[PDB]
């Protein structure tokens, strides 16, 4: 039975590959030959948000586009007022080892998680004027890689146990569990309509899930190494990825195959984070080599470099407004680039 | 009033400096080791689903934060990025054990990891009394698993602890030599392995860790001051 089932699975793999290849008439490079290249994109460090003790591992912009939460391995969440560099909050964490942080779209909560296998929800707007833990979402058997708020009550989280889970914060129990990734899930990205989310794992494959149904819609396997970053294209029909193999790949949900790969021969180090600009034309990627490269999404060539970090650029994020880009680094400073 | 907001930010920065002092004054240690190794007993004997079990203990008025990784997947590639820039790694091995080759491969992976390249390893060879009993009894011999012990002879520098048979000293020094060889193969001077012959009940473990942290911090400062 095992051999027969494997043969059937390989036949299905071949069918999927053939269909994807047939759908490949042109490539995004050919279509984007016409469009004039973005040219030289230059952005300067408008702010430096210092005050963290240890490596900054994650950051997330608030929907208001001014406040941004930031996590460091010293057990500190700091909500910065990006405009004035003010520390709005400094939430001490019960677990020093934090690998992810999220900001609720309403701005009322920040989620947090890491090597404690727990995603802690913090209530920013209590009546006591002190940020307190609103919930602790236990149930993962590995570290929390990424977490994102669907709303004030729903949060979906990756894990190093190779599963993604959707939670109901009031109840504190997993509404549904997404299984199928063969390696540690390293990042999420919620679609702008929040009906779909895509997760990259250490098995070098990116999967698309349906939150309401709870099942993998389709799978993408372009990369040769583990995926460290993933972000949805603003249109919601494509998403970029970042892998240790030092290349981004842009997939389209409807073509169900890679559209383009962003890589250069000198670029020989892994990617830690990726995101698009407001229009989706620029694909900002952070790298292990202490700097961040700006790519022309439609084309395949660098449009600039956000050099200026003294250590690994661990996290990167673009305001929902699209006005500025915040990049955190293992040297413990966030920098806002505009 | 944004002036009051700036005052609040000032207060937060004051608290952050207060905590920065504690963070600087404390040393962080990553505890590793296979389940058969008595790392759990090592943390238990410290007299001061979940993924980490922090242990606080203090020696000569210096605080040590020892982190033991708990519920985590069998592959340690990714989460060991966090423990980059810790004071040291305490890799514990069962000397008696035979999964000693698994321990050797694990130690090789830890040593040659990209991010742990500047992290010294306080290599613990635990359960040495059990190794002594194993060798003396003759039920099992390391020659069955490793062929070089049929050729190895005790080096001169091997100081015999009183009451130790020559056979057990030779065995334990062969075990030590395995790990020292793995460490010296890639040791470029950025990180140093610190082998130790230890037992589960030994209260000397905290003192040994403190001494090796003293040496590691001494090397770090020496490199910082351009003396190495």
């Amino acid at each position, epitope marked *: 039975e095992l051999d027969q089932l494997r043969q059937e699975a390989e036949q299905l793999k071949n069918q999927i590959r053939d269909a994807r290849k047939a759908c490949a008439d042109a490539t995004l490079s050919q279509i984007t030959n016409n469009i004039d290249p973005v040219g030289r994109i230059q952005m300067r460090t408008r702010r430096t948000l210092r005050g963290h003790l240890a490596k900054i591992y994650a950051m997330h912009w608030g929907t208001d586009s*001014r*406040l941004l939460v930031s996590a460091s391995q010293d057990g500190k969440l700091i909500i910065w*007022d990006s405009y*004035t560099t*003010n520390k*709005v*909050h400094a939430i001490p964490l019960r677990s020093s080892w934090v690998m992810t942080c999220a900001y609720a779209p309403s*701005g009322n909560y920040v989620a947090c998680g890491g090597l404690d296998n727990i995603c802690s929800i913090y209530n920013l*707007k209590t*009546r*006591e*004027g*002190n940020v307190r833990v609103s919930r602790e979402l236990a149930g993962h058997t590995g570290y929390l890689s990424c977490c994102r708020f669907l709303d004030d009550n729903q949060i979906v989280t990756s894990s190093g146990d190779t599963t993604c889970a959707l939670w109901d914060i009031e109840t504190g129990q997993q509404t549904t569990t997404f299984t199928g990734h063969t390696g540690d899930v390293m990042s999420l990205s919620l679609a702008p309509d929040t009906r779909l989310f895509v997760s990259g794992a250490c098995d070098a494959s990116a999967k698309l899930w349906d939150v309401r149904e709870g099942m993998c819609r389709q799978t993408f396997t372009g990369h040769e190494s583990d995926i460290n970053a993933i972000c949805f294209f603003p249109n919601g029909n494509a998403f970029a990825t970042g892998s240790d193999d030092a290349t981004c790949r842009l997939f389209d949900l409807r073509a169900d195959q890679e559209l383009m790969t962003y890589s250069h021969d000198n670029i020989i180090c892994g990617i830690t984070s990726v995101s698009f600009s407001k229009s989706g034309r620029l694909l900002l990627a952070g790298y292990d080599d202490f700097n961040c490269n700006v790519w022309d999404a439609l084309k395949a060539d660098r449009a600039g470099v956000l050099a200026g970090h003294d250590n690994r650029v661990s996290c990167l994020g673009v305001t929902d407004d699209g006005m500025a880009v915040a990049t955190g680094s293992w040297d413990s400073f966030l920098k806002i680039w505009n | *009033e*944004d*002036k*009051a*907001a700036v*005052e*609040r930010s000032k*207060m937060i920065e004051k608290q952050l400096q207060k905590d920065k002092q504690v963070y600087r004054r404390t040393l962080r240690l990553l505890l590793l080791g296979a389940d058969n190794s008595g790392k759990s007993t090592i943390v238990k004997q410290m007299r001061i689903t979940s993924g980490i079990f922090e242990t606080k203990f203090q020696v000569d008025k210096v605080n040590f934060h020892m982190f033991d990784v708990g519920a985590q997947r069998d592959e340690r590639r990714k989460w060991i990025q966090c423990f980059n820039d810790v004071t040291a790694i305490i890799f514990v091995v069962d000397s008696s054990d035979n999964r000693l080759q698994e321990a050797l491969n694990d130690f090789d992976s830890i040593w040659n990891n990209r991010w742990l390249r500047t992290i010294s390893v306080i290599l613990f060879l635990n359960k040495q009394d059990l190794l002594a009993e194993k060798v003396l009894a003759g039920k099992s011999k390391i020659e069955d698993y490793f062929p070089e012990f049929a050729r190895y002879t005790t080096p001169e520098d091997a100081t015999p602890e009183p009451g130790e048979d020559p056979r057990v000293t030779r065995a334990k020094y062969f075990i030590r030599k395995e790990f020292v060889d793995i460490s010296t193969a890639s040791g470029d001077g950025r990180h140093i392995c610190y082998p130790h012959f230890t037992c589960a009940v030994d209260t000397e473990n905290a003192r040994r860790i403190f001494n090796d942290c003293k040496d590691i911090i001494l090397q770090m400062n020496l490199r910082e001051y351009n003396l190495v």
Partner: single-chain antibody, 228 residues
């Protein structure tokens, strides 16, 4: 969240007193406290302020030097010592809680207060002293300011307070547009940067009371009463 004032009573004009307010149910340290006096048959008047961490302190010109504000975090108590008094100082002394950071709501909670008795400014003017009205109707309570309350940063620092008879004031609208937590959507805030309007849409039996405007660019308005 509970702030109960202490002291109060009869004092001769040359005498001295000390009002104490004990905070309960919130992190008293993080909040900057105010003292606001409510003289009989007259509107609110801001007395003094002490920021978080016993830092910046301000007093009104009338009581600058005469009064002194003090704060004790361990006891969660706010003090207001008056070395000298007058007949004017007779007033219900409220202790007001406020916190300042981006998006916060200053002056959200008001203590019950104690009635002490005794033997340039941005003047706020309210268009009407009293507004006879019927239940279920909308009312456009309006006020003006000496200078535009719209700061360079981009928000008008205007606050609206409702004082139900026999109650302490309650924050309705802060920064001219944002409803306070627990305030029903009946109320609405609007303004031009120099003139402002609190346009309640449907009156309720609990919405009848005296409405005070305040600026925070501290001065309160004369107060507009609602008569059902």
């Amino acid at each position: 969240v509970q702030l109960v004032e202490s002291g109060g009573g009869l004092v001769q004009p040359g005498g001295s007193r000390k009002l104490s307010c004990s905070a309960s149910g919130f992190a008293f340290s993080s909040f900057g406290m105010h003292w606001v006096r409510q003289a009989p048959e007259k509107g609110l008047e801001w007395v003094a302020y002490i920021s978080s961490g016993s830092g910046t302190i301000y007093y009104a010109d009338t009581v600058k030097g005469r009064f002194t504000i003090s704060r004790d975090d361990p006891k969660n108590t706010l003090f207001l010592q008056m070395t000298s008094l007058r007949s004017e100082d007779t007033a219900m002394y409220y202790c007001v809680r406020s916190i300042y950071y981006y998006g916060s709501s200053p002056f959200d909670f008001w203590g019950q207060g104690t009635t002490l008795t005794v033997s340039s400014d941005i003047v706020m003017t309210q268009a009407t002293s009293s507004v006879p009205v019927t239940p279920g109707e909308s009312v456009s309570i309006s006020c003006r300011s000496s200078k535009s309350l719209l700061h360079s940063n981009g928000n008008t620092y205007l606050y609206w307070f409702l004082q139900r008879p026999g109650q302490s004031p309650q924050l309705l609208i802060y920064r001219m547009s944002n409803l306070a937590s627990g305030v029903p959507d009946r109320f609405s805030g609007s303004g031009s940067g120099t003139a402002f309007t609190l346009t309640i849409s449907r009156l309720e039996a609990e919405d009848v009371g005296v409405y005070y405007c305040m600026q925070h660019l501290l001065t309160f308005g004369a107060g507009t009463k609602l008569e059902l």
